[PDB]
Design a protein around this ligand. Structure first.
Ligand SMILES: Nc1ncnc2c1ncn2[C@@H]1O[C@H](COP(=O)(O)OP(=O)(O)O)[C@@H](O)[C@H]1O
Ligand SMILES: Nc1ncnc2c1ncn2[C@@H]1O[C@H](COP(=O)(O)OP(=O)(O)O)[C@@H](O)[C@H]1O
Ligand SMILES: Cc1cn([C@H]2C[C@H](O)[C@@H](COP(=O)(O)OP(=O)(O)O)O2)c(=O)[nH]c1=O
Ligand SMILES: Cc1cn([C@H]2C[C@H](O)[C@@H](COP(=O)(O)OP(=O)(O)O)O2)c(=O)[nH]c1=O
Ligand SMILES: [Cl-]
Ligand SMILES: [Mg+2]
Ligand SMILES: [Mg+2]
Ligand SMILES: [Mg+2]
Ligand SMILES: [Mg+2]
Ligand SMILES: [Mg+2]
Ligand SMILES: [Mg+2]
Ligand SMILES: [Mg+2]
Ligand SMILES: [Mg+2]
Lengths: 183, 187
């Protein structure tokens, strides 16, 4: 299998590009599974967090419980069948939002995640970058945006950072260009 | 300052019975008391999540931990800060026994998760009601309860100042008197 993720602020085009990427792979005859966080593991976590505000620690731990189920019940089985699995958000979302955004320490986040994810990491992560005011109270969102960019510059072999303000088809073509060597 | 006390033991061991008797006993002495419980003292909706069929044990622990994090921050630490005796019917040792010894999750990882979740908060005393496993989430069968029961006893041997191990099969009033005797010098 091949594991790919989409990351970025809300309104950065993740769901759009994940859809277009799955469609590209379908056109090439490649088995593909599209999934998302939160809720790919525990739908009830997503719906709970829609209407409950918690401490950052509790928030993260719920995202992590979802992720633990998501990895085991959805992603790993898809990869085991040889599918390309695309997740619209994954662990980097917690690192950016709960870590850089709400201030939780990354080493702890990563120790929690080590068991939650079974160490599963995407081969490539497409970060759709734009300022919060361009996404289709701002201080939090700037911390998240900058946090994503920090994660990306720490792992330049995994992250591909794209200008989320470009036209959709152009972004999709850029994702395809980056992906083709790996298929 | 406050005083933090917990009750632990298998399902059916008398924890709730004793926690409530203790709360009333201490209140009758004029002490401010806060009685709480896990799971649900932090995030009541966690009890719904915990019933999910076929949960991985990692997800199960993470749910318990999310509740615990909210519980410690929003309920227990503020109660202690007001000088209350805070009694929790279950706390972290439940996860160590059930998710660690029972489900087989690694104890150090459970503790690392917990360290931020609990902000390091540990009870002064933990009353372990030791119940035979046959007298006692999915897969809560005999084999599991034997592992949990023995796991609790291991935790108690490892922290023998904090744990007070009591025979859960003794009469309710005898157990209550034993709990009271351990607390007298602290209150
Ligand atoms: N490159 C783009 N240019 C203009 N509009 C876009 C682009 N990509 C997505 N959209 C539109 O922007 C909004 C957010 O896209 P979406 O894919 O839902 O982002 P996310 O999942 O990151 O929140 C949607 O209305 C979508 O149709
Ligand atoms: N010391 C005891 N001896 C016999 N039965 C007991 C004793 N303590 C409690 N019980 C009974 O055992 C059952 C379980 O008690 P409970 O306090 O709910 O345990 P837990 O909260 O540990 O599950 C209840 O029916 C209760 O009345
Ligand atoms: C996966 C994940 C998401 N999130 C946040 C980012 C988004 O604000 C939200 C996901 O939103 P989602 O459930 O797509 O709903 P909405 O589109 O109504 O925001 O969850 C985290 O904070 N941490 C995480 O680990
Ligand atoms: C607090 C906690 C409880 N548990 C289990 C013990 C019980 O089987 C279940 C609920 O505990 P509890 O609420 O004490 O029991 P009840 O539903 O009878 O009121 O959760 C764990 O597995 N780990 C934990 O961390
Ligand atoms: Cl001790
Ligand atoms: Mg989306
Ligand atoms: Mg999640
Ligand atoms: Mg995680
Ligand atoms: Mg990712
Ligand atoms: Mg009870
Ligand atoms: Mg709990
Ligand atoms: Mg915990
Ligand atoms: Mg305890």
């Amino acid at each position: 299998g091949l594991f790919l993720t989409l990351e970025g602020l809300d309104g950065s085009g993740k769901t759009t590009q994940a859809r277009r990427l799955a469609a590209f792979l379908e056109a090439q005859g490649r088995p593909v599974l599209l999934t998302r966080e939160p809720g790919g593991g525990l739908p009830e976590v997503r719906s709970l967090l829609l209407t409950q505000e918690l401490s950052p620690e509790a928030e993260y731990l719920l995202f992590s419980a979802d992720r633990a189920e998501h990895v085991r019940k959805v992603i790993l089985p898809g990869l085991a069948a040889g599918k390309v699995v695309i997740s619209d958000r994954y662990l980097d979302s917690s690192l950016a939002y709960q870590g850089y955004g709400r201030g939780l320490p990354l080493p702890w986040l990563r120790e929690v995640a080590r068991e939650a994810t079974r160490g599963l990491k995407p081969r490539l992560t497409f970060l759709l970058d734009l300022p919060p005011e361009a996404a289709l109270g701002l201080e939090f969102f700037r911390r998240v945006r900058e946090g994503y960019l920090a994660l990306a510059r720490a792992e330049p072999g995994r992250f591909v950072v794209l200008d989320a303000t470009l036209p959709e088809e152009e972004i999709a073509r850029a994702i395809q260009a980056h992906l083709r060597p790996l298929l």
